[PDB]
C-alpha cells in the first residue's frame, strides 16, 4: 500500500479545519494564551459560520494566483529508509484486505440471532464498541453481517452500536513485501499580517495534535514529530511583504506490496521404497 502523505494531510486538514473554525468556543480554547487584540481580530475575520473571510489550503507551485490573506501551503520534502525486515517481509495474509473502516450500525433482530449490517463485506472484525462476546454468544461473521445469540441478549434488540472492521477484497493469499520509510513534509502558513500567521500556526498545531487519534495515522503514519522554523519574509518584491513560519512534519510509514501465491496443497503421496 503506497502512501501519499500529502493527499492524506489535505483530506485530514480540510474538514477538520473547517469544523474547528466553525465554532468560537474551540477557537477561544486554542487562543487562550494570546492577547485580546489579535485573538479577537482573528475571530472576527475567520471564525464563525457566517465568516466573510475564509482560509484555503493547497499544494505548491499553483499556476493560478493564490490568496495570501491566510493560506496553508504544503510541499512534499525529503524521505529516507530507516528500517528493514528479513527478506523485506512485513506480514502474511490469507485473505486480501483493504482499508480499515469504522461504521455505525444499529442492532437488528433475526429469528435466531441479533445482527448488525454493514456497508461492505468483512475480512476481519477488530472491535465492537463496549462489547466482549463470550462463547455463549457465539460471535459469527457471515459476509456483510455479524451476529450473536438472540435469547440471552434480548434486552439489547436496538443497541445503537458502532463497528471497527476491515474490507474484504479477495479470497487469495500472499505475502507482504516492503520496508519502512521515514518521511519529512513541510507545511507553512502565509499571510501579509504576521499576527494572522501566528494564530494560523497555533491552529495548525492544534489540528496536528487532534489528528493523532485518527484511525489512518494510528495504523499507517505512526511516530509524528514536529519542527518549526523562524518567522521570515517570504517575499519582499511586492508592495508589502509575505510573512510565514514553515513547519516540518515527520512520519513513519510502511511502503509495501502484496505478492500473491498460487501454491495450495490438498493431497499427500506418502509411499515407501524398495531395493
Amino acid at each position: 500500500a503506497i502512501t501519499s502523505v500529502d493527499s492524506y494531510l489535505l483530506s485530514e486538514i480540510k474538514p477538520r479545519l473547517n469544523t474547528v473554525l466553525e465554532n468560537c468556543y474551540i477557537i477561544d480554547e486554542v487562543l487562550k494564551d494570546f492577547d485580546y487584540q489579535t485573538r479577537e481580530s482573528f475571530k472576527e475575520a475567520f471564525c464563525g459560520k457566517n465568516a466573510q473571510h475564509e482560509v484555503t489550503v493547497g499544494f505548491n507551485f499553483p499556476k493560478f494566483k493564490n490568496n495570501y490573506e491566510a493560506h496553508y501551503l504544503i510541499q512534499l520534502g525529503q524521505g529516507q529508509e530507516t528500517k528493514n525486515s528479513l527478506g523485506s517481509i512485513q506480514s502474511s495474509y490469507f485473505e486480501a484486505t483493504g482499508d480499515t473502516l469504522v461504521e455505525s450500525s444499529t442492532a437488528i433482530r433475526e429469528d435466531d440471532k441479533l445482527v448488525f449490517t454493514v456497508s461492505k463485506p468483512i475480512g476481519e472484525l477488530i472491535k465492537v464498541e463496549d462489547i466482549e462476546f463470550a462463547k455463549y454468544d457465539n460471535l459469527q461473521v457471515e459476509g456483510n453481517k455479524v451476529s450473536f445469540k438472540y435469547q440471552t441478549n434480548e434486552d439489547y434488540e436496538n443497541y445503537n452500536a458502532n463497528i471497527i472492521f476491515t474490507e474484504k477484497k479477495n479470497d487469495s493469499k500472499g505475502l507482504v513485501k516492503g520496508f519502512t520509510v521515514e518521511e519529512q513534509v513541510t507545511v507553512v502558513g502565509l499571510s501579509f499580517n504576521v499576527d494572522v500567521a501566528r494564530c494560523l500556526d497555533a491552529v495548525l498545531k492544534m489540528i496536528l495534535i487532534s489528528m493523532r487519534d485518527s484511525i489512518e495515522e494510528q495504523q499507517t503514519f505512526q511516530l509524528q514529530n514536529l519542527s518549526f522554523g523562524d518567522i521570515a519574509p517570504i517575499i519582499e518584491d511586492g508592495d508589502s511583504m509575505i510573512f510565514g513560519r514553515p513547519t516540518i512534519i515527520k512520519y513513519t510509514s510502511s511502503l509495501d506490496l502484496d505478492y500473491t501465491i498460487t501454491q495450495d496443497i490438498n493431497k499427500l503421496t506418502f509411499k515407501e521404497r524398495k531395493d
Binding site: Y68, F192, I235, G238, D239, S240, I242
Partner: peptide
C-alpha cells in the same frame, strides 16, 4: 509599485451634481 498582494476598493470620491455635457442657453 502595483497593488497585487493587497487590494483595496476605489476611493469614495464626493460627487458633484453638475450634469456632464450640459447644454447652456
Amino acid at each position: 509599485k502595483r497593488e497585487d498582494v493587497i487590494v483595496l476598493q476605489d476611493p469614495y470620491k464626493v460627487n458633484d451634481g453638475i450634469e456632464e455635457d450640459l447644454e447652456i442657453q
